[PDB]
A paper describes a structure:
Sequanamycins are bacterial ribosome inhibitors that interact with the ribosome in a similar manner to classic macrolides like erythromycin and clarithromycin, but with binding characteristics that allow them to overcome the inherent macrolide resistance of Mtb. Like other macrolides, the sequanamycins bind in a narrow part of the peptide exit tunnel at a site that lies between the peptidyl transferase center and a constriction in the tunnel that occludes the lumen, near ribosomal proteins L4 and L22.
Further optimization of the carbamate moiety at C8 resulted in SEQ-9 (IC50 = 0.065 μM), which demonstrated desirable absorption, distribution, metabolism, and elimination (ADME) properties. The cryo-EM structure shows density for a methyl group on the N6 position of A2058; however, there was no extra density indicating methylation for A2057 or A2059.25 In addition to the extra density, there was a significant movement of SEQ-9 away from A2058 in the methylated ribosome as compared with the unmethylated ribosome. The distance from the N6 of A2058 to the 3′-hydroxyl oxygen of SEQ-9 is 2.9 Å in the unmethylated ribosome and 3.7 Å in the methylated ribosome. The distance from the N1 of A2059 to the oxygen linking the ketoallose group to the C5 position of the lactone ring shifts from 3.4 Å in the unmethylated ribosome to 4.5 Å in the methylated ribosome. Moreover, the additional hydrogen bond in SEQ-977, formed between the NH of the sulfonylamide from the carbamate group at C8 and N1 of A2062, is not observed here: A2062 lines up along the wall of the tunnel in an analogous manner to the SEQ-569 structure. However, the weak electron density of the C13 and C8 side chains in the cryo-EM density map of the Mtb ribosome-SEQ-9 complex suggests that these side chains may be quite flexible and interact with the peptide tunnel wall through non-specific interactions.
Residue numbers in the entry: 2 to 273
Write the structure that this text describes.
Amino acid sequence: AIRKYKPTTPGRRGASVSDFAEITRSTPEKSLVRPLHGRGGRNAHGRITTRHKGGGHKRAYRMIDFRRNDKDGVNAKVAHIEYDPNRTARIALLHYLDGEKRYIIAPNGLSQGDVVESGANADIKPGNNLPLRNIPAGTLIHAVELRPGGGAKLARSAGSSIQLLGKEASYASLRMPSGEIRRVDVRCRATVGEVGNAEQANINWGKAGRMRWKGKRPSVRGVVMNPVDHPHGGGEGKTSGGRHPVSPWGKPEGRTRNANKSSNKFIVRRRR
RNA sequence: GCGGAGUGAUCUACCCAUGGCCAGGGUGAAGCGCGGGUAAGACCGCGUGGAGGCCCGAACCCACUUAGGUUGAAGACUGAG
RNA sequence: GCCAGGCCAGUCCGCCCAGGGUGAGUCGGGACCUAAGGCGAGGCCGACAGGCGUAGUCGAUGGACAACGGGUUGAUAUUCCCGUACCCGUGUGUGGGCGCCCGUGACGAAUCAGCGGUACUAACCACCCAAAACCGGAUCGAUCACUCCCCUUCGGGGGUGUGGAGUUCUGGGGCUGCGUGGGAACUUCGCUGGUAGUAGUCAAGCGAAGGGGUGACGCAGGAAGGUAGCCGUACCAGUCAGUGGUAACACUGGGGCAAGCCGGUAGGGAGAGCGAUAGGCAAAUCCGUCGCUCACUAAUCCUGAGAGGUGACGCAUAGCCGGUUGAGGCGAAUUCGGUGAUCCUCUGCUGCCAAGAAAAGCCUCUAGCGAGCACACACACGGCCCGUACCCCAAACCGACACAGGUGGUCAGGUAGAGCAUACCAAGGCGUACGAGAUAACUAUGGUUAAGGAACUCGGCAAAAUGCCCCCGUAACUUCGGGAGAAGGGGGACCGGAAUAUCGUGAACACCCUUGCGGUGGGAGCGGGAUCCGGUCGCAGAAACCAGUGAGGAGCGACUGUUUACUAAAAACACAGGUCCGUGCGAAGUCGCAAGACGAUGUAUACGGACUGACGCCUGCCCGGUGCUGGAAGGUUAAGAGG
RNA sequence: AAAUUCCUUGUCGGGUAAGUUCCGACCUGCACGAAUGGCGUAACGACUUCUCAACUGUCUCAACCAUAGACUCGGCGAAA
RNA sequence: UCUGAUCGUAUUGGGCAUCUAACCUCGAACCCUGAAUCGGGUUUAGGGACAGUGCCUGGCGGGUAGUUUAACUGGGGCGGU
RNA sequence: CAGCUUGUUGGUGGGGUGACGGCCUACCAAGGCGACGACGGGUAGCCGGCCUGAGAGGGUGUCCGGCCACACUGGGACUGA
RNA sequence: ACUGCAGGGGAGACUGGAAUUCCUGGUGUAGCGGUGGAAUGCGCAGAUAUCAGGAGGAACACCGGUGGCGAAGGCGGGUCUCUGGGCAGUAACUGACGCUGAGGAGCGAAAGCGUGGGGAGCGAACAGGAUUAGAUACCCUGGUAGUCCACGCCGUAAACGGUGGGUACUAGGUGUGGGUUUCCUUCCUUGGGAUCCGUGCCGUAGCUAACGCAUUAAGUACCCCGCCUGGGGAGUACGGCC
RNA sequence: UCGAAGGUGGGAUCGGCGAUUGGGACGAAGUCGUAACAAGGUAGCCGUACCGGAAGGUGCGGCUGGAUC
Ligand SMILES: [Mg+2]
Ligand SMILES: [Mg+2]
Ligand SMILES: [Mg+2]
Ligand SMILES: [Mg+2]
Ligand SMILES: [Mg+2]
Ligand SMILES: [Mg+2]
Ligand SMILES: [Mg+2]
Ligand SMILES: [Mg+2]
Ligand SMILES: [Mg+2]
Ligand SMILES: [Mg+2]
Ligand SMILES: [Mg+2]
Ligand SMILES: [Mg+2]
Ligand SMILES: [Mg+2]
Ligand SMILES: [Mg+2]
Ligand SMILES: [Mg+2]
Ligand SMILES: [Mg+2]
Ligand SMILES: [Mg+2]
Ligand SMILES: [Mg+2]
Ligand SMILES: [Mg+2]
Ligand SMILES: [Mg+2]
Ligand SMILES: [Mg+2]
Ligand SMILES: [Mg+2]
Ligand SMILES: [Mg+2]
Ligand SMILES: [Mg+2]
Ligand SMILES: [Mg+2]
Ligand SMILES: [Mg+2]
Ligand SMILES: [Mg+2]
Ligand SMILES: [Mg+2]
Ligand SMILES: [Mg+2]
Ligand SMILES: [Mg+2]
Ligand SMILES: [Mg+2]
Ligand SMILES: [Mg+2]
Ligand SMILES: [Mg+2]
Ligand SMILES: [Mg+2]
Ligand SMILES: [Mg+2]
Ligand SMILES: [Mg+2]
Ligand SMILES: [Mg+2]
Ligand SMILES: [Mg+2]
Ligand SMILES: [Mg+2]
Ligand SMILES: [Mg+2]
Ligand SMILES: [Mg+2]
Ligand SMILES: [Mg+2]
Ligand SMILES: [Mg+2]
Ligand SMILES: [Mg+2]
Ligand SMILES: [Mg+2]
Ligand SMILES: [Mg+2]
Ligand SMILES: [Mg+2]
Ligand SMILES: [Mg+2]
Ligand SMILES: [Mg+2]
Ligand SMILES: [Mg+2]
Ligand SMILES: [Mg+2]
Ligand SMILES: [Mg+2]
Ligand SMILES: [Mg+2]
Ligand SMILES: [Mg+2]
Ligand SMILES: [Mg+2]
Ligand SMILES: [Mg+2]
Ligand SMILES: [Mg+2]
Ligand SMILES: [Mg+2]
Ligand SMILES: [Mg+2]
Ligand SMILES: [Mg+2]
Ligand SMILES: [Mg+2]
Ligand SMILES: [Mg+2]
Ligand SMILES: [Mg+2]
Ligand SMILES: [Mg+2]
Ligand SMILES: [Mg+2]
Ligand SMILES: [Mg+2]
Ligand SMILES: [Mg+2]
Ligand SMILES: [Mg+2]
Ligand SMILES: [Mg+2]
Ligand SMILES: [Mg+2]
Ligand SMILES: [Mg+2]
Ligand SMILES: [Mg+2]
Ligand SMILES: [Mg+2]
Ligand SMILES: [Mg+2]
Ligand SMILES: [Mg+2]
Ligand SMILES: [Mg+2]
Ligand SMILES: [Mg+2]
Ligand SMILES: [Mg+2]
Ligand SMILES: [Mg+2]
Ligand SMILES: [Mg+2]
Ligand SMILES: [Mg+2]
Ligand SMILES: [Mg+2]
Ligand SMILES: [Mg+2]
Ligand SMILES: [Mg+2]
Ligand SMILES: [Mg+2]
Ligand SMILES: [Mg+2]
Ligand SMILES: [Mg+2]
Ligand SMILES: [Mg+2]
Ligand SMILES: [Mg+2]
Ligand SMILES: [Mg+2]
Ligand SMILES: [Mg+2]
Ligand SMILES: [Mg+2]
Ligand SMILES: [Mg+2]
Ligand SMILES: [Mg+2]
Ligand SMILES: [Mg+2]
Ligand SMILES: [Mg+2]
Ligand SMILES: [Mg+2]
Ligand SMILES: [Mg+2]
Ligand SMILES: [Mg+2]
Ligand SMILES: [Mg+2]
Ligand SMILES: [Mg+2]
Ligand SMILES: [Mg+2]
Ligand SMILES: [Mg+2]
Ligand SMILES: [Mg+2]
Ligand SMILES: [Mg+2]
Ligand SMILES: [Mg+2]
Ligand SMILES: [Mg+2]
Ligand SMILES: [Mg+2]
Ligand SMILES: [Mg+2]
Ligand SMILES: [Mg+2]
Ligand SMILES: [Mg+2]
Ligand SMILES: [Mg+2]
Ligand SMILES: [Mg+2]
Ligand SMILES: [Mg+2]
Ligand SMILES: [Mg+2]
Ligand SMILES: [Mg+2]
Ligand SMILES: [Mg+2]
Ligand SMILES: [Mg+2]
Ligand SMILES: [Mg+2]
Ligand SMILES: [Mg+2]
Ligand SMILES: [Mg+2]
Ligand SMILES: [Mg+2]
Ligand SMILES: [Mg+2]
Ligand SMILES: [Mg+2]
Ligand SMILES: [Mg+2]
Ligand SMILES: [Mg+2]
Ligand SMILES: [Mg+2]
Ligand SMILES: [Mg+2]
Ligand SMILES: [Mg+2]
Ligand SMILES: [Mg+2]
Ligand SMILES: [Mg+2]
Ligand SMILES: [Mg+2]
Ligand SMILES: [Mg+2]
Ligand SMILES: [Mg+2]
């Protein structure tokens, strides 16, 4: 699962890395790859809108099939499990019996060579994609969509899962990875099972260089700035900031969710 | 110093795309084998292997100390480290 | 040319004057392609100004694409000329081949009659229920009438037995139906004869829209096989350098040549047919997927550095003659080894995680077009636009200067050396622009120093010292990796012998066979390193240049890194790790009036903010204040309503 | 008794011939204290600080040599 | 009958519920469209008189802006006046 | 005190001894010792004997006798049976 | 070896009910909780109580015992999969292949440690109330780690039968468990008798200072291992291993 | 060549002193509490964790070397 480096250097002393034991076919599928380029956290104006971005290893995008709507009743065979630099889960390449190749998020327990079904008549097995109406309550699902046909949007990171609490009339109550209970329409599609690569959260990056490779740039604390730069700046020695904690633009801590967002009627219980 | 409207990222700060460069030595990680060990092991020793914000050190990038310069060769440099 | 300029002078000049000089189908670009990014028809947004952006169109620092050697001018040359190549296009002939119609072959339906799928289902058969209505059983309680019985103010209970419209369970045909299962004819579909081998389709060639494949990609590390270059050498042509020796292999010089074409080596890679087909915006014989057979260690095919041939009867060259010292003319030998890449095979191979452009181009499929086509040879032609002079670690560029500064890429020889360090040299350049003198102090840059050895000083600042290779040996502590080159020691030159395979590198003459760019033995010639023993010299053998000082105790920051261009490099910043808070998704946050964008082609193991800052042990008490989160009983409180 | 301690060269011990610095304690903390983290910590440092070996013109205490200037002659010829 | 408690036609506003048709959707499909992740239109699936916006109005608001922050004084500050 | 040894273990050919022998030397093998305690630390002359104890045993090595080791400390050769 | 027998022996996976708590809604108003007595605390902004639905973790009443199993520690909600051991019977097979075991190795309650998850209830630490001269406690109200899961670490308990393992022998009486066996075999009795393996109690001899042991010995003998030489200091110091 | 003595160096082992500091034993007729021996007033012990002037207290698991129906 996780391989620990040996303390041969100070940079490697405590670090660890995935063993990549689940990976076959170390190259991607040429027909499902699109170009990508970095932004450095800059928007269309050319200005930094997200801080601490840039550098980073070059990447290529792999088209993930997040809809899974048009292959109902058509079986697929899992051909490979591949590394993806754009997400924390691994991806599985599917060979459809119709001759088409697709990429999906690899669920937990979807070894190469398995058969994957879709539609209302599919069996309840990891990797099978069904509308929520046909999934029994208490199941663990992932890659759920908010609107019918809108594409999977929830529970997509490594190790994520959603528990189908129940379907009442035309809505399904879901326990979402944050712990918030939500309702979505029963016609929304979901995939059975939990997302794989669940142990990646235990990886110990060893040095600053590794995060620079992953594209994360250094972050400077507010209390070591000058007051013209940050509200926490100033002071003779080191201070705690001369006030209650605030953002670099002076906003205090507290809830930032819009108080009367339209979706409030779909949320049963806020997270802890 | 204040206001209005414009000009500047050929210097410099960061970022994006596409290219180039890093003499010569040293150390010897994982993994892979063989043998020892056992019921199996764990482990151990020999090889192979060639990792690393690894070591010494030119090009290259810097600028710690000191001497000189200080109407300078130079509006920030030279010599030795 | 010499009155300005050149840090002096100048007959000289990067200065002044006149004239001359830059030749491309292949070099670098355009006419080809796209990245980041720019502009942007319509468009969306915005009082106006304008912002953003789709189709599209630009934009190399990248992709694709055809040339090498020699000569020549005062000044250009892969451009001109000579020799020899390659790429794209056009015309003219010649030859055979396939096609239009003819027919050639092949493939190739449709009509209508015989039965079932009993699929349709009027009905019919079975399975449960309303099991309808109704006959009618047991129980219930305070209604009800009946007859038997009893107190009472004359109004009703009770033993309730019967049943009434009575509650519930249920005894019985469940006729009518519901739901399901079998299920009547034509009707949906199939077979046999039949329309009929008929209609009809395909069979030269081109397909550039569109589909598909390729193009197409990271970093690190070698190894093997090669080659360039370099060092010798067979052979060739010469020299006598006025010194003691040296007359020929003693010494000096030579000991060359490309693209292209042929070739298919070492090394690499590849299963082949047939059938089906929901997918690839239409189609597809293409791609993808699936099934079957055969094949698998082979064979075949592709790729492929090198070797060899040709290019080359040519060019070049050491040298020799004559030479206004310009041009001329002649012109030898050219073999075999060693060493050896930063280059080639190799867009390969191995390993790793941080997971590594696009489009054109090329190939292929069909849509489509199509009566003429495709090919071979020969001849004759067309190949456009811009750059090309000269400087280019500089006196010609950026620094006001002919300024000790700065400036990307390519080539890069010998001896010693690990080396692109360092010392001296080659090829090739240069002596660079004020000089000539003179033992003043003093300043600067170097050098040496008796005895002492940090006594100097804020402080060992500066200088001195250590320094290489090989062999021994190596502490506390430790996160077990380190500390460590710890510390501290020993040896090092030359000559000879071992020593003729001593050893190790490659492998000539000469040894077999599937005869080749083949295999084995073989050991010549040529290079390399180490050790032991004996001897020799010096003050000194790492010889010059070059080239770690080491140890012990504390503080701070874990570490590599970053920082005040021009007085501060640190204990400051960052960091991996930690906790808290926010964010349920065109999220929170940020830019923007807005549209829109980034976040992210991400989805709570994610993203943003704050503080702390490897690791180890831990992180105590306080919610009074102020923030944040949540609640709404009460008080207070705006516009509006009311008037 | 600290990058925090004014008094202050606090007191005791070590080191030195002689130690306001250094190291180990004491606790009388002017004015330490647990993520503006507390206490340690192998490795690392052109960081700050103390000691030792070796070495030396840093010094006792200076002396000599060469070069570039300074000095003389010819030419050009500024500046505050 | 200050009629507290109260009924039925008017009228009205406040809550709650439902609906769809205004309005909303970066849900989907098709056309403009030959090349289109823009835009617009058509249909559909949802939300829905909410939200958003205009005008009026209360709160909060070092996020930004313009400013103020006296004099005397055996120098100024401290104190005092 | 849990790992000790490299002339150390053995063999070969010489040298050396009065005499066998790594005793010494040149070459070859990788062996030899160790939990029945090597290697290391502390202590000590051994025995016949002496004392005590019914005995087994416990203590001790002085008179005397036997031997060993030493001659200021450390090292070496010669004469000689 | 073959045939039967009993079992909470162990591991994994799925799953069930009761109860507590919490959430939502209905009914509903002024108390609830707590003690020897109270107060802190909770509710009045709608609590306790009652109903219905949902969420979640822990533990499995009745069976259940004096019982069974396991080397010890320990072991029962149910089902399935995998697996260990024991007992009985035949004597089918080998033929002393046995016992103990220095060191060594493995297993090993609870508490605790590392990493991730989980957390209903309880509950060190901590806080408030109460008692008391004081109350850093006993009592009450709360409440963190922990108790739970996964993989590791730790190897300590009054880890006790305060009794090392193996074998042979030494009256009986009375319960229970698993077998087998003829007979009384219907005396239905699943009783009695015989044997083997256990598990309790009482009791003969013997042993013991006594208490007591007594076929499950602390009796009579043998073999092997471990341990003690008065009490503190001390199972502590130093050294060493983990 | 070997070879006593001597010098240089890093280590190994055994002791002595040491500012300061921890625990132990004994002393007197001190101060602060009553933890155990009774159900010792909250039963006592065993292993661990945490806390507090101190004896000790609390939690987890085990024993009776106590009692109860
Ligand atoms: Mg812009
Ligand atoms: Mg950030
Ligand atoms: Mg930071
Ligand atoms: Mg600052
Ligand atoms: Mg700024
Ligand atoms: Mg501010
Ligand atoms: Mg500050
Ligand atoms: Mg401060
Ligand atoms: Mg803070
Ligand atoms: Mg501040
Ligand atoms: Mg201005
Ligand atoms: Mg501009
Ligand atoms: Mg290197
Ligand atoms: Mg290895
Ligand atoms: Mg490095
Ligand atoms: Mg810098
Ligand atoms: Mg200076
Ligand atoms: Mg000067
Ligand atoms: Mg300098
Ligand atoms: Mg320098
Ligand atoms: Mg002139
Ligand atoms: Mg002049
Ligand atoms: Mg634009
Ligand atoms: Mg326009
Ligand atoms: Mg563009
Ligand atoms: Mg262009
Ligand atoms: Mg280019
Ligand atoms: Mg020229
Ligand atoms: Mg030509
Ligand atoms: Mg690609
Ligand atoms: Mg090679
Ligand atoms: Mg001569
Ligand atoms: Mg020669
Ligand atoms: Mg195919
Ligand atoms: Mg050739
Ligand atoms: Mg030119
Ligand atoms: Mg030129
Ligand atoms: Mg140029
Ligand atoms: Mg210039
Ligand atoms: Mg210059
Ligand atoms: Mg440069
Ligand atoms: Mg060279
Ligand atoms: Mg050089
Ligand atoms: Mg020279
Ligand atoms: Mg001169
Ligand atoms: Mg003079
Ligand atoms: Mg001297
Ligand atoms: Mg001297
Ligand atoms: Mg000194
Ligand atoms: Mg001094
Ligand atoms: Mg002095
Ligand atoms: Mg110095
Ligand atoms: Mg020096
Ligand atoms: Mg050394
Ligand atoms: Mg050290
Ligand atoms: Mg000599
Ligand atoms: Mg060095
Ligand atoms: Mg300290
Ligand atoms: Mg640092
Ligand atoms: Mg620290
Ligand atoms: Mg500076
Ligand atoms: Mg500086
Ligand atoms: Mg620095
Ligand atoms: Mg900084
Ligand atoms: Mg937003
Ligand atoms: Mg969070
Ligand atoms: Mg905070
Ligand atoms: Mg900090
Ligand atoms: Mg951080
Ligand atoms: Mg507070
Ligand atoms: Mg507060
Ligand atoms: Mg409060
Ligand atoms: Mg509030
Ligand atoms: Mg102090
Ligand atoms: Mg202080
Ligand atoms: Mg002091
Ligand atoms: Mg000093
Ligand atoms: Mg001190
Ligand atoms: Mg705190
Ligand atoms: Mg502080
Ligand atoms: Mg704090
Ligand atoms: Mg800190
Ligand atoms: Mg500290
Ligand atoms: Mg550094
Ligand atoms: Mg530093
Ligand atoms: Mg100090
Ligand atoms: Mg003069
Ligand atoms: Mg509205
Ligand atoms: Mg404000
Ligand atoms: Mg202001
Ligand atoms: Mg003003
Ligand atoms: Mg005043
Ligand atoms: Mg005054
Ligand atoms: Mg020998
Ligand atoms: Mg011998
Ligand atoms: Mg003695
Ligand atoms: Mg006796
Ligand atoms: Mg002696
Ligand atoms: Mg004497
Ligand atoms: Mg002697
Ligand atoms: Mg004699
Ligand atoms: Mg003799
Ligand atoms: Mg488990
Ligand atoms: Mg809860
Ligand atoms: Mg309620
Ligand atoms: Mg309730
Ligand atoms: Mg037999
Ligand atoms: Mg045993
Ligand atoms: Mg044992
Ligand atoms: Mg436990
Ligand atoms: Mg734990
Ligand atoms: Mg945890
Ligand atoms: Mg309290
Ligand atoms: Mg309690
Ligand atoms: Mg509680
Ligand atoms: Mg803890
Ligand atoms: Mg264990
Ligand atoms: Mg027990
Ligand atoms: Mg015994
Ligand atoms: Mg026994
Ligand atoms: Mg026994
Ligand atoms: Mg019995
Ligand atoms: Mg008894
Ligand atoms: Mg006894
Ligand atoms: Mg102990
Ligand atoms: Mg110890
Ligand atoms: Mg003392
Ligand atoms: Mg007591
Ligand atoms: Mg007690
Ligand atoms: Mg009491
Ligand atoms: Mg008690
Ligand atoms: Mg307590
Ligand atoms: Mg306890
Ligand atoms: Mg207990």
